[PDB]
Amino acid sequence: TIDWSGVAAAVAAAEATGGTVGATIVAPGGETFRHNGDRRFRAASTVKIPLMIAVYRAVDAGERALTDRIVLRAADKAPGSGVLLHLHDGLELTLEDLVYLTISISDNTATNLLIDLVGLDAVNDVIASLGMRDSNLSRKMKGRPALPDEPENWATPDDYALAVQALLEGRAASQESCTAMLAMLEKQQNPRRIGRYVPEGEGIRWGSKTGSLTGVVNDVGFITTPAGTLVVAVFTENLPDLHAGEQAIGDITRAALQATGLIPPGAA
């Protein structure tokens, strides 16, 4: 039987300076810890998950292929995270390159190119089909939060946990595509959040999609060991700074790994 007190303590410490945490964490058994699970947070880059799903569903339907060519144009270059914004106009990429850049390093140009290819409606169709009732993609990547009167991309921890579960269960798209998408998440380049206290060892894997904006630090993903898989969706808002946000997610995740017996028991 699971003791969540350490996870609750990690959450309380993260919120002590006045910020807010939302967390939905699903144990191997299916038992679920929720704190502000249905509260609305800025998704930031985590919304690139359902975008990726829309892409692979298009590939499943044979509407496009991973080897399809897309050319980098000056008009497409977005501010914020990514590398394409600084690479030469005319660079020829593939659809798979775009998915990879989108997920691994949160490339905003690659993201907006995929949004153009598949369209907003297709991503929102994915979100609805996954039972994600309070989430959406309505705004291309700009590297900044929307102003109050501009459409924002909203998430809830509950919704993003459903998204990861769908991938793990082969429900999000075809099983081949779910397997490929989980492998993309494993290519996440920032190990400081969900990834921080994942132990090194055989048969251990993790993947996630981070999200960051000023006052916003999120990470959504999974950790798999031979003993089972932990689903983790944590959103944080108005913590003191980036460091505090990353530390909070790492601590909450670590406490969850201990609570579910995925790593050995340890300090809170």
List the helices and strands and how they pair.
Elements: H1 5-15, E1 20-26, E2 32-35, E3 41-42, H2 48-60, E4 69-71, E5 92-94, H3 95-104, H4 108-118, H5 120-129, E6 154-155, H6 157-168, H7 175-185, E7 205-213, E8 216-225, E9 228-237, H8 242-259
Antiparallel strand pairs: 1-2, 1-9, 3-6, 4-5, 7-8, 8-9
PDB class: hydrolase
Keywords: ABA-sandwich, Structural Genomics, Midwest Center for Structural Genomics (MCSG), PSI-Biology, cytoplasmic, Hydrolase
Assembly: monomeric
Looking at the overall shape, the CATH architecture is 3-Layer(aba) Sandwich
Structural class: alpha+beta
| Total of domains | 1
N-to-C order of helices and strands = HEEEHEEHHHEHHEEEH
How many E-type strands?
9
Enzyme class: hydrolase
Protein name: beta-lactamase
EC number: 3.5.2.6
Catalytic activity: a beta-lactam + H2O = a substituted beta-amino acid
